Design a protein around this ligand. Structure first.
Ligand SMILES: [Mg+2]
Ligand SMILES: [Mg+2]
Ligand SMILES: [Mg+2]
Ligand SMILES: [Mg+2]
Ligand SMILES: [Mg+2]
Ligand SMILES: [Mg+2]
Ligand SMILES: [Mg+2]
Ligand SMILES: [Mg+2]
Ligand SMILES: [Mg+2]
Ligand SMILES: [Mg+2]
Ligand SMILES: [Mg+2]
Ligand SMILES: [Mg+2]
Ligand SMILES: [Mg+2]
Ligand SMILES: [Mg+2]
Ligand SMILES: [Mg+2]
Ligand SMILES: [Mg+2]
Ligand SMILES: [Mg+2]
Ligand SMILES: [Mg+2]
Ligand SMILES: [Mg+2]
Ligand SMILES: [Mg+2]
Ligand SMILES: [Mg+2]
Ligand SMILES: [Mg+2]
Ligand SMILES: [Mg+2]
Ligand SMILES: [Mg+2]
Ligand SMILES: [Mg+2]
Ligand SMILES: [Mg+2]
Ligand SMILES: [Mg+2]
Ligand SMILES: [Mg+2]
Ligand SMILES: [Mg+2]
Ligand SMILES: [Mg+2]
Ligand SMILES: [Mg+2]
Ligand SMILES: [Mg+2]
Ligand SMILES: [Mg+2]
Ligand SMILES: [Mg+2]
Ligand SMILES: [Mg+2]
Ligand SMILES: [Mg+2]
Ligand SMILES: [Mg+2]
Ligand SMILES: [Mg+2]
Ligand SMILES: [Mg+2]
Ligand SMILES: [Mg+2]
Ligand SMILES: [Mg+2]
Ligand SMILES: [Mg+2]
Ligand SMILES: [Mg+2]
Ligand SMILES: [Mg+2]
Ligand SMILES: [Mg+2]
Ligand SMILES: [Mg+2]
Ligand SMILES: [Mg+2]
Ligand SMILES: [Mg+2]
Ligand SMILES: [Mg+2]
Ligand SMILES: [Mg+2]
Ligand SMILES: [Mg+2]
Ligand SMILES: [Mg+2]
Ligand SMILES: [Mg+2]
Ligand SMILES: [Mg+2]
Ligand SMILES: [Mg+2]
Ligand SMILES: [Mg+2]
Ligand SMILES: [Mg+2]
Ligand SMILES: [Mg+2]
Ligand SMILES: [Mg+2]
Ligand SMILES: [Mg+2]
Ligand SMILES: [Mg+2]
Ligand SMILES: [Mg+2]
Ligand SMILES: [Mg+2]
Ligand SMILES: [Mg+2]
Ligand SMILES: [Mg+2]
Ligand SMILES: [Mg+2]
Ligand SMILES: [Mg+2]
Ligand SMILES: [Mg+2]
Ligand SMILES: [Mg+2]
Ligand SMILES: [Mg+2]
Ligand SMILES: [Mg+2]
Ligand SMILES: [Mg+2]
Lengths: 129, 150, 144
RNA sequence: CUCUUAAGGUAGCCAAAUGCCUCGUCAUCUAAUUAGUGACGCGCAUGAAUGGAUUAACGAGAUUCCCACUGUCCCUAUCUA
RNA sequence: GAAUUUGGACAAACUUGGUCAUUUAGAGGAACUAAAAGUCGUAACAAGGUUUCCGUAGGUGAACCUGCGGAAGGAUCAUUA
RNA sequence: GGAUAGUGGCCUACCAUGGUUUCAACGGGUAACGGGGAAUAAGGGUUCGAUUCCGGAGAGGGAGCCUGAGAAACGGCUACCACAUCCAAGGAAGGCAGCAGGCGCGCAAAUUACCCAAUCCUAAUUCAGGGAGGUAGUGACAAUAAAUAACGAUACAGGGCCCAUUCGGGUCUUGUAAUUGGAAUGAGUACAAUGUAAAUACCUUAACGAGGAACAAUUGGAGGGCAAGUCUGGUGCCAGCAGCCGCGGUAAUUCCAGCUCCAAUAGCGUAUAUUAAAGUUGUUGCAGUUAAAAAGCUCGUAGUUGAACUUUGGGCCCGGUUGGCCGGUCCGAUUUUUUCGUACUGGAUUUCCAACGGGGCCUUUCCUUCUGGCUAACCUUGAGUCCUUGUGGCUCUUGGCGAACCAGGACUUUUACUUUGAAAAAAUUAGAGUGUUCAAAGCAGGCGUAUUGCUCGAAUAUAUUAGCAUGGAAUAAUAGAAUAGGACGUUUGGUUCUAUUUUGUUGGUUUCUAGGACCAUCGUAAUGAUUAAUAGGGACGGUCGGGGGCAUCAGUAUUCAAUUGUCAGAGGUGAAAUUCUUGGAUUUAUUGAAGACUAACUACUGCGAAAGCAUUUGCCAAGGACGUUUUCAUUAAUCAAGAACGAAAGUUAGGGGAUCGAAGAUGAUCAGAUACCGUCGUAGUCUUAACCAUAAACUAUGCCGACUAGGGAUCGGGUGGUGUUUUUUUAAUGACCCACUCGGCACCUUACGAGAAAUCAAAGUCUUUGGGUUCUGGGGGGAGUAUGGUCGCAAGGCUGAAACUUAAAGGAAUUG
């Protein structure tokens, strides 16, 4: 049985990148996926992506533009206090100079750079670089 | 995959992208309803009702063309059954298997299959108890089972 | 994935499961079972002194050949009899029978050292002076 | 390996109701034990339905000890028919 | 209002036994290890000279032998021809 | 009710049968007082805390109580228990886990010193008392600072930069000294003062105090790891060394030593524990085909975990912050020229681009509760008009009743989460200031006219649970209208419950009146039910199968038998022997009995959860896959406990007992031959009714989900093909052919990828480490042993240690 859906999404993307493809299929389509995909497009690690209306839960076609190394999920969506974002970024990001750890705060879903600014926190969704 | 088999089949239906339609039907909900109840009073199950309506009466679905799924209609008309169709057929089944066990007592596979079926029945009834469609107690009893399917 | 539960509400399992598993770890179990206080010839104490019962000439293990000089000591604090190696050239002549000597571990944490079999200890003092000092003739053994 | 009359004591078991020596040796119980038990076994002369070994229950059977009990005794006295 | 004294609750403690915990002696028994040396055989490793191994069962100075079913980790990835 | 200072099963009487638990109760253990804190420095963690502060308990063991505000007090008493002192033998008396000190204990821990000067406490009290506390003694616990020598002189040697034709060589600067000379100093010993309660030491300081027999630094080590001898003498598998690998058997780089050398140094070694190293406990973060390790299989409770959707988007207002820019001068100003360029500050508002962040609104959207304000509408009393119609339309008038609206206060259906605070002891820790001469420290101090003063301080961070307060609502839970016992309200009845003020006062009653609770009635309303998962279950449809149970049918063979024909061998083997045979063996013929088995067809084929399942037919119930515009709608994934099934053997009995055949017997073989080969044969081999619960129960590879690659077969199903083949004429139909497509048993090639490799489409998507989840392993032995428990008729199964021992055991591959 499917468990994370935002897991199998990011994996397909990750998988499709590695094998040289510049487009993926993502079933099913959760809002959490899209908001993630949004965050992942705001810094152009993916290109255009288009929802497909099955009368169900959805599909998505994301366009890939190389330069993606890994888009990961973290499960379980741990509780991150504000001065612990510092710690995750330490652990699961390549360098201090880039990369992202997108979260879920009460102030919506956002990359860790952003939360750092708005001074918010919550659970962790995953990461991009 | 399968719950009790180790099977990985996908053989399903495929409902169309069409909450409205069909342009060739022309018969009005109010009419088809009075055919469902006609059949439900002639003692017929929702499953095998929409099977006749899908076949001979060219009615594709019931949630479309009437806005309501079949069983929901029967309940409104007081043609709601005692226990649900799944639970029922499961209980009927488990009954007959046991009736086979009672004479053929070395059928170890039979016994095995009963353990599967009755697992299903209880899992079901548990849920049905959870959503108020069976009384708090209920539970499937073997000794009394043959009775409940009449 | 991984074979360990990852739920946000699984701490109990992850917690007991390691507590359950610390037991295959020898050093841990020795500590928890108090082997130290029970089966060990010392209390767990780093040293023990007992009285020298007899002198022994235990022969070495293969592929060596020599007569390692030791003593059967009887530990005062718990009457246990264990034997201990007497280090350095002819120091065995510094200890006598009935002579009360300080023993120490062989620095193996309980195991036998080298080719000396059955011997897990060593003589450090004798009639309370120091074997080391005696062997170097800077101290003298007080009379018996 | 060998002598001999057919073969040459296996599984077990034991100073056992079967052991001479013997009041066997060790351990145990006691102040003290030719007694009892647990062990040992080149066992005079144990041993497999001439049944061997085990064995719960049972016994007016033989035997050891403990507790209780007590004129059995120390040590006798008194009463009734 | 002292000695003295009735009952009560509190209740140390004594006698006898039970139990749980932590320790501990013991004739004798039965193992392991040091251990690589020795005696008897040669079980395994080469098709190890009876392919090896597994479970079970019985048997034998000793390793082991034999039955039934299994595995290949075999000594065969192989006979549409 | 008693009792207590008071609550309370605290105790009692009476009454009920309740209270805790796999979210681990209860019980056991602790070499357990709890906390502040300590050791270990990537992070995460690991281990420790008797011990300076707080809390707790106890005063040899227990119990009891006197006094008092306070004690169940012990430098208080009473008794028992355990100790034990004095005695004139009658009696009497003690309680150091206070300070010293003694014994004992042990590896392990100091003076029976001085004092109230300080810190503080007590009392009737400025005074008295204080083994509180301070002082000194013993003190290499731990920590700080750092002497054991410094600069010359010269003779060779030369770093000698050269001159330069040569032992011709300038002039400082290293190094060697049984060569030289002047300076320096506190360790000490000690006048003094200082210090002190009195002493002592420290600081300060006269008189002394240096040249090698001192003012003489040690502890380890010198094969590797690992820094430093192939020098010498000694020993000869001895003595001995060696954490580990190893050194020693007459040329020992490893023993015993001399020499020299290395490392740390007022210190270094050893033992024991513990942390790091250890990604060897793995949350971060391990491993499980073959190295240790996936339960034989399926079900299943607890646990963990669980598809997608419900305000999305648009447009405004508002003041915020890092860079453009340039003015201005501290300051090292740089390629190195002159009027040329590398950290510091100022900056409001430009519309001059960018990013970003806080607060408000509008877009159907501040809802929900409450209160305050402003009052419409609304019936209402009373005076007035109009009507091609009593139409109550319009106005003013009396007092009720407060839609909407504005504001402000409380407001999560119920949680988790997260932000920000508050309430928070000191010390310790992090850390700002401060020149204890530095430092560990300490919390001090700093300035001046220093002849009657001035002055900054003693910060800050901390805290990772829980509670309290607060901003947030993404994520994750949860509640709610379905037989409407639905929601809202300026509709209105009700019967219940409470009564503020008004009837003088207080009290009873009752009426109107008001609010709550509730029941109806009336109105307003878009009246209320998300998808239909390449999740799951159920129905249905035609299939498919060596899936299962009972019954039934068949096949030849094997053995045996009756009868049979014929005559000397037959058996068995590498070769034999034991054996059978003129009561005719063996071979042949007819015939019958019995029990097992199910050949060939049979395959990299099918079915089942696994074990396993193969002659026929009848009955019996089951099953996947497919098909499906059918149905229910999260009902599910995995699973401690618990349960079904579970090869062969084996066990309890009955039946059966052909064959083969454990035990046994025999013939050979051998040195032996309990064997292998041959012969006879018990049990067993089959079945029924009970057991057993294990196998290399194997793919030595958990399950569900998703993803990444190429090809050809084949099984089941389905779709498409003016394809083939079949008749008496070429329709249906059957088989077959091609393409497709699900779902299978597998095979092939590949290698982006993985691995130690063998190899792997999973064993991949793993240091770019997280989809959910169950189980197991943590060097080799000891050992699947002992012990306890449990199930079993038994055999045994399940559960399952430690002492000790040991440097490898082990995998894959390579070359011999
Ligand atoms: Mg699927
Ligand atoms: Mg399942
Ligand atoms: Mg001895
Ligand atoms: Mg003879
Ligand atoms: Mg015999
Ligand atoms: Mg025998
Ligand atoms: Mg005898
Ligand atoms: Mg007997
Ligand atoms: Mg006798
Ligand atoms: Mg006696
Ligand atoms: Mg007697
Ligand atoms: Mg006896
Ligand atoms: Mg006899
Ligand atoms: Mg006989
Ligand atoms: Mg008998
Ligand atoms: Mg009798
Ligand atoms: Mg015995
Ligand atoms: Mg013996
Ligand atoms: Mg062999
Ligand atoms: Mg062999
Ligand atoms: Mg192996
Ligand atoms: Mg009270
Ligand atoms: Mg009460
Ligand atoms: Mg009760
Ligand atoms: Mg502790
Ligand atoms: Mg304690
Ligand atoms: Mg403490
Ligand atoms: Mg603790
Ligand atoms: Mg203690
Ligand atoms: Mg007290
Ligand atoms: Mg004491
Ligand atoms: Mg007082
Ligand atoms: Mg006191
Ligand atoms: Mg007391
Ligand atoms: Mg005292
Ligand atoms: Mg004392
Ligand atoms: Mg004294
Ligand atoms: Mg000592
Ligand atoms: Mg000390
Ligand atoms: Mg004072
Ligand atoms: Mg005073
Ligand atoms: Mg006075
Ligand atoms: Mg010196
Ligand atoms: Mg000198
Ligand atoms: Mg030295
Ligand atoms: Mg070196
Ligand atoms: Mg030498
Ligand atoms: Mg060395
Ligand atoms: Mg040397
Ligand atoms: Mg490992
Ligand atoms: Mg293995
Ligand atoms: Mg296994
Ligand atoms: Mg969800
Ligand atoms: Mg407070
Ligand atoms: Mg809140
Ligand atoms: Mg569906
Ligand atoms: Mg089905
Ligand atoms: Mg014949
Ligand atoms: Mg056949
Ligand atoms: Mg289980
Ligand atoms: Mg035999
Ligand atoms: Mg015979
Ligand atoms: Mg035999
Ligand atoms: Mg097993
Ligand atoms: Mg998968
Ligand atoms: Mg493929
Ligand atoms: Mg189709
Ligand atoms: Mg298949
Ligand atoms: Mg390759
Ligand atoms: Mg070795
Ligand atoms: Mg190998
Ligand atoms: Mg090779």
């Amino acid at each position: 049985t499917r468990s994370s859906v935002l897991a199998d999404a990011l994996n397909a993307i990750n998988n499709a990148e590695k094998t040289g493809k510049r487009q993926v299929l993502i079933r099913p389509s959760s809002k959490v996926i899209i908001k993630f995909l949004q965050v992942m497009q705001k810094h152009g690690y993916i290109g255009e992506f288009e929802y497909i209306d099955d009368h169900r839960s959805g599909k998505i076609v994301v366009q890939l533009n190389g330069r993606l190394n890994k888009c990961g999920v973290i499960s379980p969506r741990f509780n991150v206090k504000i001065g612990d974002i510092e710690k995750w970024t330490a652990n699961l990001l390549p360098a201090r100079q880039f990369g992202y750890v997108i979260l879920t705060t009460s102030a919506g879903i956002m990359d860790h750079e952003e939360a750092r600014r708005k001074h918010v926190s919550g659970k962790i969704l995953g990461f991009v670089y | 995959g399968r719950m009790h088999s180790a099977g990985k089949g996908i053989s399903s239906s495929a409902i169309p992208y069409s909450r409205n339609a069909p342009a060739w039907f022309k018969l009005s909900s109010e009419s088809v309803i009075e055919q469902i109840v006609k059949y439900a009073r002639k003692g017929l199950t929702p499953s095998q009702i929409g099977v006749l309506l899908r076949d001979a009466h060219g009615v594709t679905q019931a949630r479309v063309i009437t806005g309501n799924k079949i069983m929901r209609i029967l309940k409104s008309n007081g043609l709601a059954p005692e226990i649900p169709e799944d639970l029922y057929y499961l209980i009927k089944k488990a009954v007959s298997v046991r009736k086979h066990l009672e004479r053929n007592r070395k059928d170890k596979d039979a016994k095995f299959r009963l353990i599967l079926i009755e697992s299903r029945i209880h899992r079901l009834a548990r849920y049905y108890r959870t959503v108020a469609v069976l009384p708090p107690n209920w539970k499937y009893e073997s000794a009394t089972a043959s009775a409940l399917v009449n | 994935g991984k074979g360990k539960p990852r739920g946000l509400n699984s701490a109990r399992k992850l917690r007991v499961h390691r507590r359950n598993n610390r037991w295959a770890e020898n050093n841990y179990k020795k500590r928890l079972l108090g082997t130290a206080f029970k089966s060990s010839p010392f209390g767990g104490s780093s040293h023990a002194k007992g009285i020298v019962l007899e002198k022994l000439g235990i022969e070495s293990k293969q592929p060596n050949s020599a007569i390692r000089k030791c003593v059967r000591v009887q530990l005062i604090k718990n009457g246990k009899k264990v034997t201990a190696f007497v280090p350095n050239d002819g120091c065995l002549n510094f200890v006598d029978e009935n002579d009360e000597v300080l023993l120490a571990g062989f620095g193996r944490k309980g195991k036998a050292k080298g080719d000396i079999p059955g011997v897990r200890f060593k003589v450090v003092k004798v009639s309370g002076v120091s074997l080391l000092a005696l062997w170097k003739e800077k101290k003298e053994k007080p009379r018996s």
